[model samples]
Target chain A: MRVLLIHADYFEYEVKDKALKNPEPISEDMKRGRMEEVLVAFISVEKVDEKNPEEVSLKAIEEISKVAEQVKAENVFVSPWAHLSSELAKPSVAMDILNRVYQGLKERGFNVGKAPFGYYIAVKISCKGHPLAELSRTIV
Target chain B: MRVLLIHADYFEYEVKDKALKNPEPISEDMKRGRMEEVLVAFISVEKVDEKNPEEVSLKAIEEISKVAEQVKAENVFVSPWAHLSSELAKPSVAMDILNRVYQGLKERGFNVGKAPFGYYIAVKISCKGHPLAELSRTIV
Candidate 1:
C-alpha cells in the first residue's frame, strides 16, 4: 500500500463524476462536505496488498494514526487514490481494504471521514504551513 | 513527462524546507504566495524525458495550455512532483525540464508561478467542482 498524508488545516470535497462503470451514487450532502484540522490520507492499494487485505488495512491505519497524532490532526479523511501506484488491486479488494481502514481509524477514536470508493471527486485542501505537513509512506 | 492539472478556485503555497541535496532558494515573497482561479500543474519528469527535454517541455506546455483554456484558468502554477513515476530523471535534468516548461508557459502569455524546483512546501488548493477540474496528460 502507498500512502500520502497531508496535514491540512481544512479539507473539502465534492463528488463530480463516477470514475468507474458502476459506482454507488453519493448523497446530496455527501456530494459536498468539509472538515477542519484534518489529515487527508490518500491511500493506494497495490496488487501485493491483496495478499492479506486485513493485515494491510491494519498496517495502513496504524501508520496513518501515528502520523495524524504527530501532526495533531483533529480529523482523518481517507481518499482512495489509485494514481499513486501503477499496479493496483482489484476494485473489490481495494474497497474492502479502504472500508477496513476507515472503520479501524474510527474505532481508534479518531474522527474519520471517507470518500466514496471508485469515484472521481474534486478536492480542496489547506495544508498546514509546517515542515511535517506532507509525508509519504509505502507499506508492504 | 507526466502532468496532472487541477483546476482550482484558489491555490496557495509556502516553501518551508528544502528537499534536495542542493536546492535553489526563492525570494521571501515567492517563498509564500497565493493565486486565485488557477490551474495547478503537478509535473513529474521521467528519465526518458531527459533525452529530449525541450521537446517534452514544448509538448507539455501545449497540452497544459489547451487544458488551461478549457478550464478558463486565470493563472498557472507548476509544481515539480517526482513521486508520480518510479523511473525519474536526475535532479539536474528534472529541474532543467521544469524551467523550460515555466519559460514556455510565460512565452505563451500565461500568468505563471513556479514553486522552488527542489523544496518541500505547504500547499492549499481549492479544486473546482467540475468534470474537467482534474486532467492528466503525458508528453513524449
Candidate 2:
C-alpha cells in the first residue's frame, strides 16, 4: 500500500542538524549487494487529488485520516527529531488516538512498542492505495 | 556461548546510547508466553547474565565486535565509561588481532549484518569478556 503525496511532516532544521555536523555516512560502497527494498517514505500530507489549494488540503488530511484508520501498527512512533521532547511536538489528536490504541492493545493482551520521538522513522507505511503494498516488509 | 572479552569499532556514544535505550523491553507480564521470545534479547544486557557487570560488559562488546568483524566495520568502538576517547582505550596490539579476525571473516565472504543503531538499542550490553571468541551466533 502506497500513498503518494507531499510529506506531511515538515523537515525541521533543528532535527537535521546532527546529520550535518558529524555526518556518519552509511557508505555507498556498503550498499553493494544489499537490496534497496527498504522503501523509505519521506511522507508528508499534500492534496494530490485537489484542483485547488483548499480542496487539496482538505483531501490530503482526509486521506491521512483514512490511512491511519486502516493499518495496525505494533508501534506508533513519534520521532523526537531534535533534542526537544516528542510530547511537545505531537498533535494532540494523534496523541489521543495513540493513548486509546495503546491502552486497548494492552487490554487485548497485545504487545506494543513506542519510540520516544514525535514521528515514526525507519518504519515504512503501506496504505491501501500504495503500489508497493504487496512488498511491505514488517519493520517492527 | 558466553564471551569473556571483545573489542568493537564504532562510535562509543552510539554504542552506549543504544545499550541504555533499547527498543525491546522485558516486561514482567511477558515472563511467560510466546510473545516473550519474539524479542528476548531486547532486554537489558545486565539482566541477561545475572547482573554480572564484568561478564555483561565484555559480552556486549564481543557481540558488537563479532558482528563488526563479520561486516568489516570501518569505525571502531570501545567503552568510554571507564576510559577516555583519546586514550588507546584497549591495547593497540590487541586491536591488531581483532582487526585480522574481522578482515578474515569479510574475506571469507561472510555478509555479516552490520549492527544498526536500533538493533544495538534493542540489545544493550556491558560485558567484560572479549567478543571474538565464543560469539553469540557466528563469525561468518
Candidate 3:
C-alpha cells in the first residue's frame, strides 16, 4: 500500500463519476464532503497486497494513526487515491481494504471521513505548510 | 525533488488563490486550463535543492523526459505540487526550478503546460490505468 498523508487545514473532494464498473454504493453526502483540520490519507492498495489485503489494511492503519498522532490531527480523511500507484489491486479489493482502514482509524478514536472508493474525484488539499505537514509512506 | 508521473487521459486545474507572499503573475487562461492525453508531472522541489537548484532542474528534466518518451507521451504537464513533500523549498526557488523544467521539456519538442506555481489549486488527474500508468521518483 502507498499512503500520502497531508496535515491539511481543509481537505475536500467531489466524486466526479464512477471509475470502476462495479463502484461501491455511497450516500449523496459521501459523494461530496469536506473535513477541516485533517490528516488526509490518500491511499492506494497495490497489487502485492495479494500477499494479504487484511494485513495490509491493519499495517496501513497503524502507520496512518502514528502520523495523525504525531501531527496532532484528530480528524482523519480516507481518500481512495488510485493515482498514487501503477500496480493497483482490483477495485473491489481496494475498496474493502480502504473501508477497513477507515473503520480501523475510527475504532482508534479518530473522527474519520472517508471518500467514496472507486470513483474519479476532483480534490483540493490545503497543506498547513510545516515540515511534517505532508508525508509519503509505502508499506509492502 | 519528488515526481509523481501520471499517464493521464485528462488533467485539469484551476488556481484558486495565492499560496505564497509573492505569487507570479499569469494569464487568465493559465489560471484554468486542461490538457488531454499527456503525462502529468506533479513535481515537488525540496529544501535540499539549496545544494544546487539549477542542477536539480536538469536532472529532473532528464528523468521526466526519460519517462515521457518511454510512454510515448507527446504532451507534458508540469504541476508544482508542494503537497508531495513536507520539506519544501521556498516558493520563488521552486517556481524558478519548475519554470526551467517547463522550458526544458518544450526545448526537447514536447508540448508542455505548467500550472501556476504558488497557488492553492483544485485539480483532477485521470490516469489511463496500465502497468506503467503512474510512477514515483525521488531525486536528492
Candidate 4:
C-alpha cells in the first residue's frame, strides 16, 4: 500500500463520478467535506494488500498518527486516491481496507474524516510548508 | 530522493519567507506563479544525494518526463518540497540538483516552471481525476 501524508492547513473535497462499477455509499455530508488544520492521508490500496489488509491498515494508521501528532494536526482525513499507485486491489477489498483505516484512526482518538472509496473527487488542499508537512510511506 | 508528481488541472504558489539561512534568489515574477493543465513535480533531495546529485537529478527527470509524455502533459512545474524526507541534503547541494532538473526538463522540449529553493511557499494543486494523475517515485 502507498500513503501520502500531508499536514494541511485546510482541505476540501466534493465527490464526483464513480471510478468503479459500484462505489461506496455516501452520506450527504460525506459527499462534500472540509477540514482545517488536518492531516490529509491519500491512500492507494495495492494488490499486495489482499490477504493482510489489516496489517497494512494498522501500520498506515500508526505512521499517519505519528506524523499528525508531531505536527499537532487537529483532524485526520482518510482519502482514498488510487492514483498514487498503478496496481490496485479489487474494489471490495480496497474499500474494506479504507474503512478499516478510517476506523482505526478514530479509535486512536483522532477526529477522523474520510472520502468514499472508488470515486473521483475534486480536492483543494493547502499543504503546510513545514519540515514535517509532507511525507510518503510505502508498506508492503 | 522522493518525488510526488501530479498531473494537475491547475497549480499555483506564492513564495513566503526563507526556510533556510539563505534562500535562492527569485525573480519578481517567480515570487508568485501559476500554470494550467500542467505536471507538477514536488521533489525532495535527501542527504544521500550529496555525492551523486547529478545521478539523482537525472533519474528524477527521467521519471517526470516519462510520466508527462505518457499523460500528454505539455507544461512542467518543478517545485522544491523537502517535507518528503526527514534527512535532507545541504541547501547548496539540493539547489544544484534542482536547477539541473529544471534545465534537463527544458532540454527535453518541455516548458518548465520552477519555484525558488529554501522558501516556504504556499501551494495549491488541483490533481486531475485520473489513474495516472498522481504518482510518487523514489530514486537512489
Model 1 spans with C-alpha error above 4 angstroms:
A20-22, A25-27, A46-48, A86-90, B18-22, B46-52, B85-90, B137-140
lDDT of 4 by residue, B17-135 (tens): 77777778878888889999999998888999997988998999999999999999999999887656767898888889999999999999999999988877877777676767767
Q: Extract clashing residue pairs from model 4.
A: none
Name every residue pair that clashes in candidate 3: none
Model 3 CAPRI rating: incorrect
Name the candidate, 2 or 3, with the larger lDDT value.
Answer: 3
lDDT of 2 by residue, A1-140 (tens): 11222111111111111223332333334221111211112212222212233343333334433333344322222221221111222233333433443344344443332322142122212222122221111111
Give DockQ for candidates 1 onward, in order. 0.49, 0.01, 0.13, 0.39
- Which regions in candidate 2 have their CA more than 4 angstroms from the true location? A1-140, B1-43, B48-50, B76-140
What is candidate 4's fraction of native contacts? 0.46
TM-score of each: 0.83, 0.20, 0.62, 0.77
Docking class of 2: incorrect
RMSD of each: 3.0, 20.2, 6.8, 3.6
The digit string of per-residue lDDT tens for model 2 on B60-109 reads 44555445555444333321111111122222222333333344434544
lDDT of 1: 0.85
Show the lowest summed lDDT stretch of 10 residues, model 2 chain B: B34-43
All candidates in order of TM-score, best leading: 1, 4, 3, 2
Evaluate residue A138 in candidate 2 and report its C-alpha lDDT on the 0 to 100 scale. 10
**Model 2 Cα RMSD, 1 decimal:** 20.2
Instruction: For model 1, state the Cα shift of residue B132 in Å.
Output: 2.9
Chain A superposition TM-score per model: 0.96, 0.26, 0.94, 0.95
Chain B TM-score for the candidates in order:
0.96, 0.24, 0.94, 0.96
Flag regions of model 4 displaced more than 4 Å: A25-31, A46-56, A82-93, A136-140, B27-29, B46-59, B69-72, B83-93, B137-140
Candidate 1, pairs of clashing residues: none
Q: Give the alpha carbon lDDT tens digit for every residue of A51-116 in model 1.
A: 999999999999999998898886999998865677899999889999999999999999999998
